[PDB]
């Protein structure tokens, strides 16, 4: 349900070390938060999000702020 999403902004550049699972951010970039947990529902420092051009992937929680 899109109308329930949080959205976030990137506070730093992030170049993905595993670009198969992770998405890149440019400082200032907006995104939507899809999940805060890993795929199995467990706590995680890596958050799943959808980028400004519709890519899905994980990013570091400490590189963003939640609008």
């Amino acid at each position: 349900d899109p109308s329930k999403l949080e959205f976030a902004r990137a506070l730093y550049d992030f170049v993905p070390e595993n670009p198969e699972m992770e998405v890149a951010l440019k400082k200032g970039d907006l995104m939507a938060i899809l999940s805060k947990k890993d795929p199995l529902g467990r706590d995680s420092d890596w958050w799943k999000v959808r980028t400004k051009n519709g890519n899905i992937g994980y990013i570091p929680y400490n590189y963003i702020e939640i609008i």
Binding site: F7, R9, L11, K27, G28, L30, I67
Partner: peptide, 8 residues
Amino acid sequence: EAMPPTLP
């Protein structure tokens, strides 16, 4: 839905 700036 969203509103800030300024990353100087």
